[PDB]
Design an enzyme around this catalytic site. Structure first.
Site, PDB file in Angstrom:
ATOM      1  N   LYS A  58      26.214 -25.864  80.059  1.00  0.00           N
ATOM      2  CA  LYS A  58      27.175 -26.329  81.015  1.00  0.00           C
ATOM      3  C   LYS A  58      26.628 -25.730  82.527  1.00  0.00           C
ATOM      4  CE  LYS A  58      30.082 -25.730  77.446  1.00  0.00           C
ATOM      5  NZ  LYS A  58      29.464 -25.591  76.058  1.00  0.00           N
ATOM      6  N   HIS A  88      42.874  -8.620  90.158  1.00  0.00           N
ATOM      7  CA  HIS A  88      43.361  -9.862  90.644  1.00  0.00           C
ATOM      8  C   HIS A  88      43.803 -10.705  89.515  1.00  0.00           C
ATOM      9  CE1 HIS A  88      43.796 -13.969  92.017  1.00  0.00           C
ATOM     10  NE2 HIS A  88      44.162 -13.426  93.165  1.00  0.00           N
ATOM     11  N   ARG A  92      39.574 -20.276  89.131  1.00  0.00           N
ATOM     12  CA  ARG A  92      40.428 -20.264  90.528  1.00  0.00           C
ATOM     13  C   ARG A  92      39.971 -19.538  91.525  1.00  0.00           C
ATOM     14  NH1 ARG A  92      45.511 -22.898  89.660  1.00  0.00           N
ATOM     15  NH2 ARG A  92      46.214 -21.912  91.529  1.00  0.00           N
ATOM     16  N   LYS A  93      38.772 -18.965  91.541  1.00  0.00           N
ATOM     17  CA  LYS A  93      38.344 -18.162  92.628  1.00  0.00           C
ATOM     18  C   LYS A  93      36.468 -18.520  92.995  1.00  0.00           C
ATOM     19  CE  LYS A  93      41.712 -15.888  94.306  1.00  0.00           C
ATOM     20  NZ  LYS A  93      42.478 -17.076  93.753  1.00  0.00           N
ATOM     21  N   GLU A 104      37.007 -24.401  73.773  1.00  0.00           N
ATOM     22  CA  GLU A 104      36.047 -24.949  72.627  1.00  0.00           C
ATOM     23  C   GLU A 104      34.874 -23.947  72.640  1.00  0.00           C
ATOM     24  OE1 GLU A 104      36.405 -26.870  75.638  1.00  0.00           O
ATOM     25  OE2 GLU A 104      38.513 -27.713  75.129  1.00  0.00           O
ATOM     26  N   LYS A 159      43.438  -8.111  97.251  1.00  0.00           N
ATOM     27  CA  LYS A 159      42.586  -9.156  97.703  1.00  0.00           C
ATOM     28  C   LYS A 159      42.043  -8.413  99.308  1.00  0.00           C
ATOM     29  CE  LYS A 159      44.145 -13.402  97.522  1.00  0.00           C
ATOM     30  NZ  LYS A 159      44.975 -14.512  97.517  1.00  0.00           N
ATOM     31  N   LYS A 198      31.333 -20.205  80.085  1.00  0.00           N
ATOM     32  CA  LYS A 198      30.452 -21.160  79.778  1.00  0.00           C
ATOM     33  C   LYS A 198      29.015 -20.810  79.604  1.00  0.00           C
ATOM     34  CE  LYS A 198      33.145 -24.162  83.357  1.00  0.00           C
ATOM     35  NZ  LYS A 198      32.763 -25.086  84.357  1.00  0.00           N
ATOM     36  N   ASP A 228      51.874 -13.050  89.594  1.00  0.00           N
ATOM     37  CA  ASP A 228      51.181 -14.461  89.817  1.00  0.00           C
ATOM     38  C   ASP A 228      50.297 -14.686  88.820  1.00  0.00           C
ATOM     39  OD1 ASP A 228      50.254 -16.578  91.406  1.00  0.00           O
ATOM     40  OD2 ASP A 228      48.535 -15.063  92.161  1.00  0.00           O
ATOM     41  N   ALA A 229      50.608 -15.918  88.247  1.00  0.00           N
ATOM     42  CA  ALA A 229      49.702 -16.258  87.104  1.00  0.00           C
ATOM     43  C   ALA A 229      48.244 -16.307  87.466  1.00  0.00           C
ATOM     44  CB  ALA A 229      50.036 -17.862  86.725  1.00  0.00           C
ATOM     45  N   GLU A 235      38.477 -20.728  78.589  1.00  0.00           N
ATOM     46  CA  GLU A 235      39.561 -20.629  79.380  1.00  0.00           C
ATOM     47  C   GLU A 235      40.252 -19.655  79.175  1.00  0.00           C
ATOM     48  OE1 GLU A 235      38.327 -22.433  81.838  1.00  0.00           O
ATOM     49  OE2 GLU A 235      37.927 -24.223  81.567  1.00  0.00           O
ATOM     50  N   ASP A 278      43.493 -13.975  88.715  1.00  0.00           N
ATOM     51  CA  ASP A 278      42.365 -14.820  88.224  1.00  0.00           C
ATOM     52  C   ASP A 278      41.301 -14.492  88.060  1.00  0.00           C
ATOM     53  OD1 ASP A 278      44.227 -17.284  89.170  1.00  0.00           O
ATOM     54  OD2 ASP A 278      43.235 -17.172  91.121  1.00  0.00           O
ATOM     55  N   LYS A 279      40.837 -13.090  88.416  1.00  0.00           N
ATOM     56  CA  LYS A 279      39.630 -12.522  88.123  1.00  0.00           C
ATOM     57  C   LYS A 279      39.682 -11.993  86.900  1.00  0.00           C
ATOM     58  CE  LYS A 279      36.216 -13.602  90.734  1.00  0.00           C
ATOM     59  NZ  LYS A 279      35.434 -14.281  89.731  1.00  0.00           N
ATOM     60  N   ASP A 315      27.632 -26.653  85.479  1.00  0.00           N
ATOM     61  CA  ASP A 315      28.162 -25.985  86.467  1.00  0.00           C
ATOM     62  C   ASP A 315      27.919 -24.788  86.721  1.00  0.00           C
ATOM     63  OD1 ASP A 315      30.136 -27.927  87.132  1.00  0.00           O
ATOM     64  OD2 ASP A 315      31.690 -27.310  85.624  1.00  0.00           O
ATOM     65  N   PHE A 366      53.989  -4.032  97.600  1.00  0.00           N
ATOM     66  CA  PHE A 366      53.180  -4.843  96.560  1.00  0.00           C
ATOM     67  C   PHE A 366      53.237  -3.824  95.261  1.00  0.00           C
ATOM     68  CE2 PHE A 366      48.639  -6.876  96.302  1.00  0.00           C
ATOM     69  CZ  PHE A 366      48.883  -7.426  95.026  1.00  0.00           C
TER      70      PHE A 366
HETATM   71  C1  LIG Z   1      32.059 -32.546  78.858  1.00  0.00           C
HETATM   72  S1  LIG Z   1      33.696 -31.850  78.968  1.00  0.00           S
HETATM   73  C2  LIG Z   1      33.143 -30.032  79.528  1.00  0.00           C
HETATM   74  C3  LIG Z   1      32.514 -29.251  78.360  1.00  0.00           C
HETATM   75  C4  LIG Z   1      33.281 -28.969  77.009  1.00  0.00           C
HETATM   76  N1  LIG Z   1      34.510 -28.055  77.649  1.00  0.00           N
HETATM   77  C5  LIG Z   1      32.547 -28.581  76.029  1.00  0.00           C
HETATM   78  O1  LIG Z   1      33.296 -27.988  75.228  1.00  0.00           O
HETATM   79  O2  LIG Z   1      31.388 -28.740  75.953  1.00  0.00           O
HETATM   80  C6  LIG Z   1      34.162 -32.176  80.706  1.00  0.00           C
HETATM   81  C7  LIG Z   1      34.871 -33.308  80.732  1.00  0.00           C
HETATM   82  O3  LIG Z   1      33.951 -34.394  80.539  1.00  0.00           O
HETATM   83  C8  LIG Z   1      34.712 -35.530  79.934  1.00  0.00           C
HETATM   84  N2  LIG Z   1      34.050 -35.563  78.444  1.00  0.00           N
HETATM   85  C9  LIG Z   1      34.911 -34.992  77.246  1.00  0.00           C
HETATM   86  N3  LIG Z   1      34.325 -35.645  76.049  1.00  0.00           N
HETATM   87  C10 LIG Z   1      33.268 -36.177  76.372  1.00  0.00           C
HETATM   88  C11 LIG Z   1      32.156 -37.284  76.123  1.00  0.00           C
HETATM   89  N4  LIG Z   1      32.143 -37.305  74.683  1.00  0.00           N
HETATM   90  N5  LIG Z   1      31.275 -37.955  76.735  1.00  0.00           N
HETATM   91  C12 LIG Z   1      31.409 -37.753  78.069  1.00  0.00           C
HETATM   92  N6  LIG Z   1      32.141 -36.920  78.784  1.00  0.00           N
HETATM   93  C13 LIG Z   1      33.040 -36.514  78.077  1.00  0.00           C
HETATM   94  C14 LIG Z   1      36.269 -35.319  80.012  1.00  0.00           C
HETATM   95  O4  LIG Z   1      36.436 -35.865  81.226  1.00  0.00           O
HETATM   96  C15 LIG Z   1      35.998 -33.659  80.071  1.00  0.00           C
HETATM   97  O5  LIG Z   1      37.247 -33.430  80.634  1.00  0.00           O
HETATM   98  C1  LIG Z   2      50.692 -14.075  96.847  1.00  0.00           C
HETATM   99  S1  LIG Z   2      50.399 -14.201  95.377  1.00  0.00           S
HETATM  100  C2  LIG Z   2      50.584 -16.265  95.359  1.00  0.00           C
HETATM  101  C3  LIG Z   2      51.908 -16.872  95.544  1.00  0.00           C
HETATM  102  C4  LIG Z   2      52.826 -16.525  94.217  1.00  0.00           C
HETATM  103  N1  LIG Z   2      52.370 -17.324  93.225  1.00  0.00           N
HETATM  104  C5  LIG Z   2      54.282 -16.661  94.624  1.00  0.00           C
HETATM  105  O1  LIG Z   2      55.062 -16.987  93.396  1.00  0.00           O
HETATM  106  O2  LIG Z   2      54.800 -16.853  95.733  1.00  0.00           O
HETATM  107  C6  LIG Z   2      48.793 -14.314  95.058  1.00  0.00           C
HETATM  108  C7  LIG Z   2      47.663 -13.307  94.957  1.00  0.00           C
HETATM  109  O3  LIG Z   2      48.309 -12.174  96.014  1.00  0.00           O
HETATM  110  C8  LIG Z   2      48.338 -11.054  95.510  1.00  0.00           C
HETATM  111  N2  LIG Z   2      49.955 -10.547  95.763  1.00  0.00           N
HETATM  112  C9  LIG Z   2      50.802 -10.697  94.553  1.00  0.00           C
HETATM  113  N3  LIG Z   2      51.854 -10.052  95.155  1.00  0.00           N
HETATM  114  C10 LIG Z   2      51.687  -9.459  96.576  1.00  0.00           C
HETATM  115  C11 LIG Z   2      52.335  -8.893  97.432  1.00  0.00           C
HETATM  116  N4  LIG Z   2      53.696  -8.297  97.089  1.00  0.00           N
HETATM  117  N5  LIG Z   2      51.936  -8.473  98.569  1.00  0.00           N
HETATM  118  C12 LIG Z   2      50.638  -9.042  98.705  1.00  0.00           C
HETATM  119  N6  LIG Z   2      49.926  -9.659  97.856  1.00  0.00           N
HETATM  120  C13 LIG Z   2      50.420  -9.869  96.761  1.00  0.00           C
HETATM  121  C14 LIG Z   2      47.732 -10.899  94.174  1.00  0.00           C
HETATM  122  O4  LIG Z   2      46.458 -10.632  94.327  1.00  0.00           O
HETATM  123  C15 LIG Z   2      48.337 -12.421  93.624  1.00  0.00           C
HETATM  124  O5  LIG Z   2      47.383 -12.873  92.636  1.00  0.00           O
HETATM  125 CL   LIG Z   3      45.301 -15.699  94.748  1.00  0.00          CL
END
Ligand SMILES: C[S@@+](CC[C@H](N)C(=O)[O-])C[C@H]1O[C@@H](n2cnc3c(N)ncnc32)[C@H](O)[C@@H]1O
Ligand SMILES: C[S@@+](CC[C@H](N)C(=O)[O-])C[C@H]1O[C@@H](n2cnc3c(N)ncnc32)[C@H](O)[C@@H]1O
Ligand SMILES: [Cl-]
Ligand SMILES: COc1ccc(-c2c(Nc3ccccn3)[nH]c3c(C4=CCCCC4)c(-c4ccccc4)nn3c2=O)cc1
Ligand SMILES: COc1ccc(-c2c(Nc3ccccn3)[nH]c3c(C4=CCCCC4)c(-c4ccccc4)nn3c2=O)cc1
Ligand SMILES: [Cl-]
Ligand SMILES: [Cl-]
Ligand SMILES: [Cl-]
Lengths: 382, 382
Positions: A276, A16, A251-252, A57, A168, A272, A245-246, A44, A18-19, A278, A237
């Site tokens: 972090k 998938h 996103r999961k 980063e 899915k 992460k 699909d991007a 990311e 996203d995965k 999270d 499919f």
């Molecule tokens: C802390 S950053 C996430 C961790 C980061 N990606 C890293 O490289 O450690 C997440 C969010 O916190 C905020 N942030 C960024 N720089 C920060 C800072 N110096 N102090 C506090 N919050 C910050 C921004 O809103 C950012 O999108």
């Molecule tokens: C349906 S797509 C999301 C909508 C899509 N971004 C669009 O442009 O309509 C989301 C997920 O469904 C699955 N998918 C993609 N094509 C599909 C298809 N033809 N039939 C069923 N599921 C599909 C894939 O796992 C994909 O990541």
């Molecule tokens: Cl999806």
């Protein structure tokens, strides 16, 4: 029947899009940790037709070959030919990685004792456990994950060679109440969608998905003549993976956790390092929740924690037991405070979070599997 | 006190990098809908230092100038100079947009009557409402959003000219139980982090955040001598926006909804047209939940729906009222079925989801604000 309800969860396969991104992000993390256990990683991944982009980063002493790490992850997933829509050998790998912001570094970890490192961000995180399965997970999400794992198994063993990696699944279970806990009764509806080759027909796919996937995963006691099956419901499919699909990392997040049960604070796990919260605090909160259930204190429990960037101790810890403990939530919270230290610089020690095991977490859920450290309950003293 | 607990929610500002992406994704959607109400849009945005990347799938009769749409959105947010870390005039805008997969199109909407269009994906979605505020939202998330809005107000009016667009807030409230409902008592902890210029000192910022932000938002009756304030807890936040942290669409889904209350099915809202039930069905579920509370049937309610790609009717609809209705959940579900039609091709009519209002939803939460159609309760017949 009165006192019953339907509940649905979904899962997705290794291919998938996203995965794919989650797995690549964690392959990058693991590659850094193999050489620098203290690497600061916030990676990311974005996937679209022919492209993996890394953005984020990283500050690390490691020397990492991103081309190799990314392409090996995609190879493992199974995207190895243009006929499948994506090929690790020939895709574009683009890198937009910078050092961690020095303003973050100074506020979080620079010149800090490890146990007293600040949280790497603010945020809220939850942990959940339910006694409805041995692994303390909801049945809906366990079954959904297992359906995707079965697809990958039958793809890799050549049984169903028309399968491709993008899939899915979705499972609706009828539940009944049981004194604050929930008890699964039957499977009401199953959805499976999976990418396939151009030659196999719909009827062959639907028969195989029922007989070789569902029946090999879902106990017959949960299936009956009324169970509804939506197998390849889109009808076609062939285009799939990032081409269909991007994909993006993170996103999961509901697939990664409890399938909608419990609660979620919004943070993604993959890409992460332990600072972090999270990820680390969500893992620790799962560990707390599972320890309370396996310890016999609750049958079902939800834990919330929260943090401020740069501050080591949680700002809040809260517990809700759904009426499934003889102890008050106040008492459970005291037990938790006496047995756990949820500073990130202590969680890292308790859960061994510098070890490069993260790619293994990035498909089929982070919880309920494989006796990761957060799945081994702590023996509680009180 | 026994029967009380802490609960935390967070929000982020318009210049938070993930929220930048949500706003750009919805600016792109709106631009298409202005010319083609039936545009099929699945637009993801990625932001890092100097870069906005659009990735995804759009099939539309519109002629859209992506450079202009993206740059105008970033201008509105306030990133207009390299001194702030990002500048709409001079950043890179990269586009990796393809048509919607024909396999999706044929399975979802090709040759289908609009009312009978299939769901654009499988998935699960929830709607929630709580009587603890007039707008039927949790106090924690309302206050968190309002703190970010106040920062933007004071930035734009020149009161606090050292402010920059990237901000995060977090609010912990002590609650008590009330017959299944929850009642806020006091604010326990507030976090505010906001990007700032190189000249202003920490003490000036902390004083302003307390006196001109918190006191202008949070009623004094909730604040006391024990309330904890973490104001600029990292100590320095000059680097911010995409330069400090990569942003992606759909990475603030809990901020976008209920701040952790209720439940979430995992789907992101921004960048998607109405056939993507991740958005339309979540909006409809909020509308149902708010209609039940405003209709006097519940004080607090959670609705789940779920779908299969290509199938118009939900696979499951479920309701939980937390013990706050005299009617059983079975009875409420019958009322919902008699009053609502949750097919996406009917939701679009009821909630006017071809109208280009989506950029307005993409900061400060999608719910509880501005009398959008899903916030206007339906009068229920039963
Ligand atoms: C802390 S950053 C996430 C961790 C980061 N990606 C890293 O490289 O450690 C997440 C969010 O916190 C905020 N942030 C960024 N720089 C920060 C800072 N110096 N102090 C506090 N919050 C910050 C921004 O809103 C950012 O999108
Ligand atoms: C349906 S797509 C999301 C909508 C899509 N971004 C669009 O442009 O309509 C989301 C997920 O469904 C699955 N998918 C993609 N094509 C599909 C298809 N033809 N039939 C069923 N599921 C599909 C894939 O796992 C994909 O990541
Ligand atoms: Cl999806
Ligand atoms: C006395 O013993 C108990 C045990 C369990 C419950 C209970 C429950 N009873 C119920 C009964 C009839 C009809 C519907 N529901 N329904 C739910 C739900 C939901 C169900 C369907 C919509 C969505 C949320 C949830 C929940 C799930 C995920 C995330 C958050 C909350 N919890 N929950 C419960 O605890 C109540 C009393
Ligand atoms: C009789 O009247 C009522 C009214 C409300 C409740 C109740 C409740 N009591 C409570 C009492 C003492 C200590 C902790 N808790 N605590 C919670 C929570 C949580 C709170 C803290 C951790 C995280 C989840 C939630 C919840 C929030 C978000 C998402 C899912 C669930 N709901 N909830 C409730 O309904 C129970 C009975
Ligand atoms: Cl739950
Ligand atoms: Cl963030
Ligand atoms: Cl809740």
């Amino acid at each position: 029947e009165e006192g019953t309800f339907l509940f649905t969860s979904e899962s997705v396969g290794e291919g998938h899009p996203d995965k794919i991104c989650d797995q690549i992000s964690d392959a990058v993390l693991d590659a850094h940790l193999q050489q620098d256990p203290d690497a600061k990683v916030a990676c990311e991944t974005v996937a679209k037709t022919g492209m993996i982009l890394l953005a984020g980063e990283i500050t690390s002493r490691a020397a990492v070959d991103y081309q190799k790490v990314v392409r090996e992850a995609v190879k493992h997933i199974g995207y190895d030919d243009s006929s499948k829509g994506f090929d690790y050998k020939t895709c574009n790998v683009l890198v937009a990685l910078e050092q961690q912001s020095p303003d973050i570094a100074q506020g979080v970890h620079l010149d800090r004792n490890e146990e007293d490192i600040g949280a790497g961000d603010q945020g809220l995180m939850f942990g959940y456990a339910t006694d409805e399965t041995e692994e303390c997970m909801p049945l809906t999400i366990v079954l959904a994950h297992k359906l995707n794992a079965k697809l990958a198994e039958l793809r890799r063993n050549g049984t169903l060679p028309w399968l491709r990696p993008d899939s899915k699944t979705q499972v609706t279970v009828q539940y009944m109440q049981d004194r604050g806990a929930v008890l699964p009764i039957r499977v009401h509806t199953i959805v499976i969608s999976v990418q396939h080759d151009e030659e196999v027909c719909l009827d062959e796919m639907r028969d195989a998905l029922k007989e070789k996937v569902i029946k090999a995963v879902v106990p017959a006691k949960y299936l009956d003549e009324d169970t509804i099956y939506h197998l390849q419901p889109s009808g076609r499919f062939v285009i799939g993976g990032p081409q269909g699909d991007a994909g993006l990392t993170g996103r999961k997040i509901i697939v990664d956790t409890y399938g909608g049960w419990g609660a979620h604070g919004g943070g993604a796990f993959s890409g992460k390092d332990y600072t972090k919260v999270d990820r680390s605090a969500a893992y620790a909160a799962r560990w707390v929740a599972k320890s309370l259930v396996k310890g016999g204190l609750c049958r079902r429990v939800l834990v919330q924690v929260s943090y401020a960037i740069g501050v080591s101790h949680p700002l809040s810890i809260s517990i809700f037991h759904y009426g499934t403990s003889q102890k008050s939530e106040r008492e459970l919270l005291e037990i938790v405070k006496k047995n756990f230290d949820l500073r990130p610089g202590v969680i890292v020690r308790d859960l061994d979070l510098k070890k490069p095991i993260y790619q293994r977490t990035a498909a089929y859920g982070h919880f309920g599997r494989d006796s990761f450290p957060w799945e081994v309950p702590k023996k509680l003293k009180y």
